[PDB]
Symmetry: C2
Subunit: 471 residues, 2 copies
């Protein structure tokens, strides 16, 4: 009852003035410079990258917990709403408290899933929760394990801020546990996909009080609260919901810049036949998969790194069971503002560059002339690039052996760069006055660029023959 006139925990709390939708919000990198299209050579390949700008907005109410077995979050706790909470390390507030009622959502306990906790402390609520679970176990004595409520998330990685908001996890967890090379992703040197299998055993909620005072023992004053950190930019909160279980995170990673990485990946998780295709097996040959289990009942820093996804499938399969007789730890939670008793949400807004690539490979044209006549060739093609504007630039090339007599068995190779386009191969027999009035033995336009383009000409002057194959 300071010289402040806010001297009733209720008025002290009610007279707080804050924007509930702006106190817990965080806007990630808001950024602006890039090239729309790009052509890059790397080894025996040509990568074409395209960039769009995208924007993601989120307002999760379910907040991810970092240190599962050290995070002393419990239903009915008091926290401050600020940047610390948003950084997954909220400030707790301890004071003498009035009892609180807790409820667990396990199935088949309707009507007997509540318990009053006189002294609401991490340890004393944990015991109450344990009581509740024992009750369920007493009722269903021969059911020692239940399926976990799995929630599946999936997404490609483009930026630290994009993927965190997308999966609703601290970026540190992905960078540290799965080890995500955000710079490789940025330079499109690696394409990464991240899966998240959230395994919820059950959740426990605390009955919302109709007045902030009902939570606090009467010896606690609004002063003690401000002293503890309550203010306009640090509004008081109560944990109303806590989810218990564990999470399986998976990273699929490749050096392929192929337009089919996401589908190839997708095919592998689903185990659809398409995964046996060869454009996919090639990508799989240059991919690696990592799986880590975080949360309850997992020895910290466990990890699996493989090239055989079946090992990943095993980790997903093995960690979806909930043993009702073994301890469980908080995995996430939701909070309510003490003021209007409304659910607290963390607002995130962030732009990011979305990249889509295509991978081209070097190839060669193989000419074979076994025809009983003199012939001349004309081989031409363009080499594509992209100016700063992302616009195409074509540079015309031609085989130095064009328009030159070739007789009974000639063999050559005309290597092509991975960025070769508008490829045309022509061969004319030499009966007539000149090139312009000579018979076509083979005439191809827009020959698709592959590993090997095999052109062969044979036959007689009267009846030449020819074919073009690919590899």
């Amino acid at each position: 009852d300071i010289t402040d006139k806010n001297q009733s925990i209720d008025s002290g709390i009610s007279s707080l003035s804050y924007n509930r939708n702006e106190v817990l919000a965080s806007n990630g990198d808001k950024i602006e410079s890039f090239v729309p299209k790009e052509g890059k050579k790397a080894g025996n390949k040509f990568i074409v990258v395209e960039r769009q700008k995208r924007s993601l907005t989120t307002s999760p109410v379910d907040i991810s917990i970092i240190d599962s077995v050290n995070d002393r979050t419990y239903p009915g706790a008091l926290q401050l709403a600020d940047k610390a909470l948003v950084e997954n390390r909220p400030t707790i507030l301890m004071v003498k408290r009035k009892p609180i009622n807790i409820n667990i959502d396990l199935p088949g306990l309707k009507g007997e899933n509540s318990i009053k906790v006189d002294d609401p402390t991490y340890g004393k609520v944990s015991g109450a929760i344990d009581e509740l679970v024992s009750k369920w176990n007493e009722k269903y004595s021969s059911t020692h394990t239940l399926p976990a409520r799995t929630q599946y998330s999936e997404s490609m990685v483009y930026s630290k801020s994009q993927i965190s908001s997308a999966l609703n996890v601290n970026a540190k967890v992905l960078e540290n546990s799965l080890g995500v090379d955000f710079n490789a992703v940025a330079n499109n040197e690696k394409k990464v996909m991240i899966l998240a299998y959230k395994q919820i055993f059950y959740t426990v909620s605390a009955d919302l009080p109709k007045n902030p005072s009902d939570l606090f023992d009467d010896s606690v004053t609004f002063n003690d609260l401000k002293q503890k950190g309550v203010s306009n930019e640090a509004p008081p909160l109560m944990v109303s919901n806590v989810a218990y279980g564990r999470t399986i995170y998976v990273k699929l990673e490749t050096t392929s810049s192929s337009k089919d990485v996401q589908a190839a990946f997708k095919a592998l998780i689903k185990n659809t036949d398409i995964k046996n295709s060869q454009q996919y097996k090639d990508i799989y040959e240059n991919s690696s998969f990592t799986a880590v289990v975080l949360g309850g009942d997992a020895q910290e820093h466990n990890k699996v790194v493989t090239k055989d996804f079946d090992e990943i499938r095993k980790v997903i399969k093995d960690n979806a069971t909930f043993s009702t007789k073994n301890p469980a730890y908080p995995i996430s939670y939701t909070s309510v503002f003490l003021k209007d008793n409304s659910v607290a949400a963390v607002h995130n807004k962030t732009d990011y560059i979305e990249t889509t690539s295509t991978e081209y490979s070097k190839g060669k044209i193989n000419l074979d002339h076994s025809g009983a006549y003199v012939a001349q060739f004309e081989v031409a093609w363009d080499e594509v690039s992209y100016d700063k504007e992302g616009n195409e630039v074509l540079t015309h090339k031609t085989w130095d052996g064009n328009y030159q007599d070739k007789t009974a068995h000639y063999s050559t190779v005309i290597p092509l760069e991975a960025n070769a386009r508008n490829i045309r191969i022509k061969a004319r027999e030499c009966t007539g006055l000149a090139w312009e009035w000579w018979r076509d033995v083979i005439s191809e336009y827009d020959v698709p660029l592959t590993n090997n383009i095999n052109v062969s000409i044979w036959g007689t002057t009267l009846y030449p023959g020819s074919s073009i194959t690919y590899n």
Copy 2:
């Protein structure tokens, strides 16, 4: 020997001053305004068009003849080099002439393929040519038909100027004979491909004179020449080469805006197995093929319009033979400047917009819930468009039945627009406290948009089941 001091056909001609590389050149539409990317709905489809600017340069020396049997072009004729010549209707010059030597390139007549033509007139050179051909026929009396020297050209159509320079034909011939809808092509309402099978029977050349005077009878004065049209922008020329035969033009046309039209077309001409694929047969169902034969031995305005390419194959096959006993007509020719006796070339330069499209089709999501439990869905997706800058704009949509209990057998359809993207379908069983802590029964992201997306959920509360199929 006017008051002009140019009084010797040789000096009169030698004192002419002109740019040989600029007198016969024509620059087609040089143009500048367009949108890089565009999204267009048409029926139950969404067409995405992309535009690049391209530039084509040509310098043909072989000049296409328009009216095969009315074109009195003959080896050893005199023409003016100007815009008329470039318009495929050159100005001829007649005067008393000194003899000229002609040579035909038919095989097996080496040493006896020449003849002197005392009075070089269309009719008198035509007879000499006929003499030469009779000589060949006398030598090879039992060979009445020979294969024609076929020259194959192929190209997609983008603009009147682009296709003319590409195929080296008068645009009128394609617009008039094949009937090309250049406005439909422009609005990408029709995709057209044009083939050209030039059938050369033989060519006849005239020996170049070492002096302009040697061509002219001595009674002809430089005055008569100027009077006839010779000038600095109308330099004198002699026809040095004439090709005889006919040409088969083919048009492949479709209303499909599919990214596979060119490959589908290509597959059909080659008759490669890929043509039996279904993405190709669909395109073929919306295509039409036209074939016309121009030139010698064809009744004017003949034409074939079909949906069965085998009919086209027949016209190509049937018109490749050269009957040595039947008359032949000029199909093209080359000219030499009288000044430096150099080969005349028509220089063309033209820009054009190259368009590449992709066709998307409408689809629907089919939900079937036959599970022994209450479930809730979450269906969301974006609808893409493109701003004036060609940039993507995403508009988020959601099924109005999201987050609402659905029980023992529910069925629904969620139609999607052909521009639907980032499609996600989720279903959760309702055991728990709320949506956020409910078990996933199905969770898909980036579901490819097809005709039918069939999602079905069943099973028990403990063990739900689900699947997603496509059509």
